[PDB]
Amino acid sequence: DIVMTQSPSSLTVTAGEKVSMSCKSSQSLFTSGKQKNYLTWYQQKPGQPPKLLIYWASTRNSGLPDRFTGSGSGTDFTLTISSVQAEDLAVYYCQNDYSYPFTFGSGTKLEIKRTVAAPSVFIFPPSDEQLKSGTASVVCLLNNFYPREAKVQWKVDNALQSGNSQESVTEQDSKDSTYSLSSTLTLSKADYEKHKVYACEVTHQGLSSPVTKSFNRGE
């Protein structure tokens, strides 16, 4: 059967550049009679179903921009993007459609390189409904930064914390290619009642010095 080898697995480019992704077969995908290729390109943006991009190896779907061109035949195929925009952050999949089984490729993940964006930092004290529940989550928001590497440290009454925090990073954004991070510190209401100053220290390459956002409990 047809094994679809895709290359490279992840590739990173600057916004505006043109790039190449490769799809290679085991056996040929040529009809020999219709002189048409049964290869299809699909795009999967995060959280969505796949979208049909290109069928018959170069024919574009209805409503598609003219910056995606793939034109291979036989056993070697390429998909190329003329000007990468921030909306093209996705995984690209080739599919054999010549014969059963109609195998997919492994996927190429395309990521964006941009300039440095310092994070804007917000802190949220726990809600009164949750404090009635017995727990207290304090949330620290790092918004719209690049690159992805970022250090976040919790200080409660200027005492660096080592447990009780969980972090989550977004995918790269569809409009400006940045990342967003949340760090959530989780204490009981009792341990929360025993301290006053809650602070979030943030270190990132866009900041000349690390930035601290803080509140005092009860304001």
Next chain:
Amino acid sequence: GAGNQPGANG
């Protein structure tokens, strides 16, 4: 056309 005959020969 069809549609219910995928592939080269259906």
Next chain:
Amino acid sequence: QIQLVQSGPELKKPGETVKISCKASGYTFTNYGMNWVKQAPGKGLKWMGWINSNTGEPTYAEEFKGRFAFSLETSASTAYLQINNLKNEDTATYFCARWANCGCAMDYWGQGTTVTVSSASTKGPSVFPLAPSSKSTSGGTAALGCLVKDYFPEPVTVSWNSGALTSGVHTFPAVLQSSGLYSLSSVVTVPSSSLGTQTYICNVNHKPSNTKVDKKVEPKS
């Protein structure tokens, strides 16, 4: 105006049985065969098979023969996928997709159905506001959100203002907190002057526990 609508996400124990529906509308149903595609969480796409809408004949990929069944109900324009004797490896999102009129590509896709196979039982989330406060101020802009805490399994759906607010929204990937339950937060940045004239409502839907919550996130001070 062609839509494929799939049934909602389900939590099933190992050994149990699941059926997923795929109701198509907008085209003559019996002229376009129906494919199924598996996507394991964080992993790639695998083609499972397809069923003939005209004849009823299924065709399975070799890995899916035996525990998987494709069926149709033509009078309701609906395709069905059934997984028997559920294993751990069946936790995934299952897509139904339509053969294009070419026969060369898959044209219209459903939105996916996530099946989680686990002995554990459903927990519905609690929802707590992340109110704007001036500790939530940067530049001229304010941040606000919703904490969606202590739920099982994934997914939760979060929208804002019944889907009319999308710009500047970050819904974060959930963490697995140490209790085994999932926790998530959804945030938006808005202008700070418009707090007090705009309203921001987070809409949280956890289908496996039939939990729907609308929470108006109001300014603190």
